[PDB]
Structure formats: C-alpha cells, structure tokens
Amino acid sequence: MIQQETRLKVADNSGAREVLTIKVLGGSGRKTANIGDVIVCTVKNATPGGVVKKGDVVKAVIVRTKSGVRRNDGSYIKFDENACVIIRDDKGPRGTRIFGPVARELREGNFMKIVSLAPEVL
C-alpha cells in the first residue's frame, strides 16, 4: 500500500538507496499502489558514484511490500519492509544485481529480467 510521500529502500545496484514516491500512475484518482505497480519517484539518498544521482526523477517498480498480496488460492504473502527497483521505461532495470527476495506476481507484468536476476522468488 504505497501512496504519495512514502519512502522505499531500493533493491538494486543502480546507485540509489532511498527513494520517495511522487505519483501512482494508472488512472485519475489512483491513491495506492502495490506489488507489480509502477511509480515515479525521487532519489533522496544515493550512493557515491552510481548511475543515478540524488535529485533525479525516475520510474520504479514495487517489489516486496509490507502489506503484501492475496492470491486466488487464498494464500497470502507479506514482507517486513517496502522496496522498489528502478527501470528503463522498457520493464528492464538500470542495475544488474537485484537484492533480497521478490514476489511471484512480477511474472504477470513482464518483469522477467528482474525475476531472473533476483534471489528466491515467492
């Protein structure tokens, strides 16, 4: 459940560590985003060097929310923090190394590169 002004850790090696979200895109009046949804965001804390620099406006995909997801079998999955991965406006990442676990609902959105680069997919 990511709305405007939430802060997310970044789970790639693109260069950013902390990110603030500006907009949940989709339709007009869209308030909250969750796993698989794309957001636009700002980098509030970056790593030295790196591709992306603090103050940049970028697009990200949400992975491993805390208020996680229900599935059609009635199973649920949750995580302990909220995280995102920054993308290249083609569902591809700017980094080359995803960290932490990732949800299985990314396959339904054509994020196969992230799914492949990731460790354990749940």
């Binding site: 491993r64 079998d73 009635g74 199973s75 649920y76 999955i77 302990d80 923090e81 932490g100 354990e120």
Partner: protein
C-alpha cells in the same frame, strides 16, 4: 437441524493427512506451483507465528528470513495446493501468537527446542 449444515456441507473439503502442530514449531511446507509451463513444487521452511479459525476457514502463518529480509506466508490449512507438511522441530513458547518475532534479529529471534 439448522446448526450442523455448514459443517456437513464443508466436511468433504476437509483434509486428514495433515499432522498436528502448534505455534513455535518449525515447519517445512511443500507447495505446488502450477506455472504456465508445468506443475512444479517448492519448499518453504519457517516458524509458525499464528494459528486461527475453525474447520475449513482455518488458517496458519509461517515466518522465515531469506536474504536478510523477513517473509511471512499464510495458508489455509486444508488447501489442496499443499502437497505435504513436515514438522522438523518442536518449540517451547508461552504464548499463542508470536508477533514479537517481527522486531528481532539473530540470537534474540531464537526459540528453545521442545
């Protein structure tokens, strides 16, 4: 009779091959994943945080830590997507709901056996 209808109608959806466990016990859940390709199977090992519900609405949650990140997974007890459950370890806890594990890490989040 007007009070046994739910039980009588949901008796067939209930499973009997599952073992007995309580919170604190360490479980290994084999869940079947019907992907687009095949009917693969994947294992999920962790500590039982929560048991609740009744009959067919019964439900249980397990917790582990994969890559430095905590992960909780909640299943219906009687779902057919669970091939198999194993009770790898037995615990000692004085509490039915282990929500205090969510804010720990390491030796603090260790559970005495038996």
């Amino acid at each position: 009779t007007n009070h046994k209808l739910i039980e009588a109608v949901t008796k067939s959806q209930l499973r009997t091959d599952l073992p007995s466990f309580r919170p604190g016990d360490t479980l290994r859940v084999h869940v079947r994943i019907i992907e687009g390709t095949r009917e693969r199977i994947q294992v999920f090992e962790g500590v039982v945080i929560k048991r609740r519900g009744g009959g067919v609405s019964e439900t249980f949650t397990v917790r582990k830590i994969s890559s430095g990140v905590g992960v909780e997974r909640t299943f219906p007890l009687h779902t057919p997507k669970i091939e198999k459950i194993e009770v790898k370890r037995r615990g000692k806890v004085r509490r039915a709901k282990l929500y205090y594990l969510r804010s720990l890490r390491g030796k603090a989040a260790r559970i005495q056996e038996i």
